[PDB]
Amino acid sequence: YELDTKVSELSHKLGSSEGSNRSLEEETARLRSLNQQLSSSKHELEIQLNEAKAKVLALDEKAQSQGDVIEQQRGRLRDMEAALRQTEQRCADLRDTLASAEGRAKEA
Amino acid sequence: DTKVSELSHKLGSSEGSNRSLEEETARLRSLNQQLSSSKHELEIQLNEAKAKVLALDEKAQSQGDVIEQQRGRLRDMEAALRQTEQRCADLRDTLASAEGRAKEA
Amino acid sequence: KYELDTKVSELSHKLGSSEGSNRSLEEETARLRSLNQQLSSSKHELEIQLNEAKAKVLALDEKAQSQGDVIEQQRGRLRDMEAALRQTEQRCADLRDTLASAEGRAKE
Amino acid sequence: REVKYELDTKVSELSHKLGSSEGSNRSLEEETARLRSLNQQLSSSKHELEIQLNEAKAKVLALDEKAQSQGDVIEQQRGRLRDMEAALRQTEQRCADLRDTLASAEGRAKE
C-alpha cells in the first residue's frame, strides 16, 4: 500500500514537471524569436543613425563654408557700393564743370 | 494501483499546463495594455502633428504672400529712386550752366 | 480496499475540472494573441504615419524661420530705400530753390 | 513478494525520471532568465536608438534648410555683384568720356 502511495505522488510530481517543461520550451522559443526581431531592429536603427550623423557632418561643413562665403560677399558688396559712390561723385563733378563751361560759352 | 498512477500523472501534467496558461494569459493581457496605451499616445501625437501641418502650411502661404508683395515694392522703389536721381542730375546741370553764365558777366 | 475507488474517482474529477479550466484558458490565449498581432500592426502603421508627419512639421517650421528672416531683411531694405528716396527728393527740391535764386538775381 | 519487487522497480524508475525532469527544468529556467535579460537590454537599446535617431533627423532638417537658404542668399549676392561690376565699368567709362569732352571744350575756348 505504501509503495502504491509513493508511486502515486511520484507520478503526479512527474506530470507537473513535464508540463512545466513544455511551458519552458515554448517560452524559450518565443523569447528567441523576439530577441532576433529586436536585434534586427537595433541593427537597423544603428545603420540609420550612423547615416544621419554623417549627413549632419557633411551639411554642417557645407553650411559653414556657405556662411563664410556670405560674409565675404557682403564685404565685397560694401566695397563695390563705395567704389561706385566715389566714381559717380567724380562723374558729377565733371558734368558740373562741363555745364559751367557751356554757360560761359553761351554767355560770350 | 496502476491507473491512480497514470491518472496522477495526467492530472500533474494538467496542473502544469494550467499554470503555463495562467502565466501566459497574464503576460498577454499586460502586453495588450502596453500596446493599446502606446497606440492611443501615437494617435494623440499624430492628430497634434496633422493640425500643426495645416497651420504651418497656411502661415507659409501668408509669409510667401508678403515676401512677393515686398519684392514688388522694392522694385517700384528702385524705379522711383532711378527716376528721381535722373531728375536731380538734370536740375544740377541747369544750375551749373546758370552759374557759368553768372561767372561770365 | 475501497480507498482505491475514492482516490481514483477524486482524481478523475480533479482532471475534468482542471481541463474545463484549461481549454477555456487556451481559448483566452488564442483570442489575446490575435488582439495583439492586430495592435502591433496598427501601432506600426501609426508609427510610420507619425514619423512622416513629424518630418513634415519640422521642415515646414524651419522654412517658416527662413521666410521670417527674409521678411525682416526685406523690410530693412525697404526702410533704407524710403530714407534714400526722401533724401533724393529733398536734394531735387533744394536744387529747384537754388535755381530760382540764380535766375532771379541774374535777371536783376 | 514478487509484487513488491515490481513496485520497487517502478518507484525507482519514477524517481529518476522525475530527477531528470527537474534537471531539465532548472536548466530551462536559467536559459529563460538570460533570454529575458537580453530581451530587456535589446528593447531598451532600441528605445534609446529611436530617441537619438529622431534628434539626428531633426538636426539634418534644420541644417538642410540652412544650406538651401544660404544658397539663395549666395546666388542673389553674386547677382548684385555682377550688376555692380557692370555698373562700375560703365560709370568709369562715362567719366573718361566726360574728361575727353572737357579737354576738347576748353581747347575750343582758347581757340
Numbering used by the authors:
A (entry chain A): 7 to 114
B (entry chain C): 10 to 114
C (entry chain B): 6 to 113
D (entry chain D): 3 to 113
Manuscript text:
Centrioles have proximal-distal polarity and a 9-fold radial symmetry imparted by a likewise symmetrical central scaffold, the cartwheel. The spindle assembly abnormal protein 6 (SAS-6) self-assembles into 9-fold radially symmetric ring-shaped oligomers that stack via an unknown mechanism to form the cartwheel. SAS-6 proteins comprise a globular “head” domain at their N-terminus followed by a long coiled coil that mediates stable protein homo-dimerization (Keller et al., 2014), and a disordered C-terminal extension. The characteristic shape of the SAS-6 ring led to the proposal that the protein head domains comprise the central “hub” of the centriolar cartwheel, with SAS-6 coiled coils forming the cartwheel “spokes” (Cottee et al., 2015; Kitagawa et al., 2011; van Breugel et al., 2011; van Breugel et al., 2014; Yoshiba et al., 2019).
In contrast, structures of the CrSAS-6_CCMiddle fragment, resolved from two different crystal forms, revealed parallel complexes featuring extensive interaction interfaces between coiled-coil domains, within each crystal’s asymmetric unit. In CrSAS-6_CCMiddle crystal form I, resolved to 2.34 Å using SeMet-derived experimental phasing two copies of the coiled-coil domain in the asymmetric unit interacted over almost their entire ∼16 nm length. The association was driven primarily via ionic and hydrogen-bonding interactions between CrSAS-6 amino acid side chains, with only a small hydrophobic contribution involving the sidechain of L339, resulting in ∼1,400 Å2 of buried solvent-accessible surface area. In crystallographic structures of the CrSAS-6 coiled coil, we showed that these domains form a unit equivalent to two cartwheel spokes merging together. They do so by associating into a parallel coiled-coil complex, the formation of which does not perturb canonical domain structure; for example, the coiled coils do not unwind or adopt a tetrameric coiled-coil arrangement. Rather, complex formation relies on ionic and hydrogen-bonding interactions interspersed along the length of the coiled coils, and is very weak in solution. We evaluated that an L339E/D378N double mutation of the CrSAS-6 coiled coil (CrSAS-6_CCLD) would have the largest impact on the symmetric interaction mode, as these substitutions remove the sole hydrophobic contact seen in the symmetric complex interface (L339-L339′), as well as two salt bridges of the same complex (D378-R377′ and the symmetry-related pair). In contrast to this prediction, however, reconstitution assays with CrSAS-6LD produced abundant cartwheels, similar to those generated using the corresponding WT protein. We surmised that amino acid substitutions that remove favorable interactions of the symmetric CrSAS-6 coiled-coil complex do not affect cartwheel formation in vitro.
